[PDB]
């Protein structure tokens, strides 16, 4: 699924923390 809408409301650090959770 698309992640853009989620990442648009997260900080850069929160974004990378989410992305690293999903790896």
């Amino acid at each position, epitope marked *: *699924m*698309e*992640l*853009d809408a989620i*990442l*648009d409301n997260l900080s*850069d650090e929160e*974004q*990378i923390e989410l*992305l*690293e959770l*999903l*790896e």
Partner: antibody
Amino acid sequence: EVQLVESGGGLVQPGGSLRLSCAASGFNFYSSYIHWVRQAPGKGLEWVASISPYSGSTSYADSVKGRFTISADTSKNTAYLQMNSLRAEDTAVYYCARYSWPWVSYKPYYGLHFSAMDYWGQGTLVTVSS
Amino acid sequence: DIQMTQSPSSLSASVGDRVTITCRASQSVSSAVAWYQQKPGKAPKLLIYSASSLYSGVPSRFSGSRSGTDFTLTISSLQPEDFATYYCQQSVSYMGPLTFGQGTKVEIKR
């Protein structure tokens, strides 16, 4: 097929303005991110700006903040880069390019997938000179 | 900001050789790394996306791998038409700054 055609480049005196346009043909423009990426003669690639054409959200490189404005018309499937206060260091070939949406997706059992610039226009040359 | 340090700035190799180009991200960029090939006077062409996925239509000798913040473009069997400048590019910041990496000029040795 998929095409990006750039227009509006040319010679302009220091401090002047130019407006680049990028007409997109064979793909959903509402479902894309548009980027302007420039290359000064003999130098590397430098990202300039990004836009999501439907929501109009934009991002700029620090080198151009306040001077450049990226915009898009979803009716004409055309993105635009309005460049003000041009300096010699702005001299470059300006490329239009595209991310197909989404920027990043996640699929269970397969992981993350990040979009990349798969379609680029041929470029338009901007020369800032007296 | 987030820097892509692309080593060797240039290299020369013979037809058929295996060539590797490296890109170190100054911090985590996940797999948000693309590899482009640019021939003179032309727009860059996408080779690798999402750090390891071969773009459709690209010859199989191009491949990308990731280990942490190190990204490797491998050309396993160098062809004369591979003369070009190659660039990595990160996109880990959603609608944030995209940075490239200085490029690698690949000359063909004959």
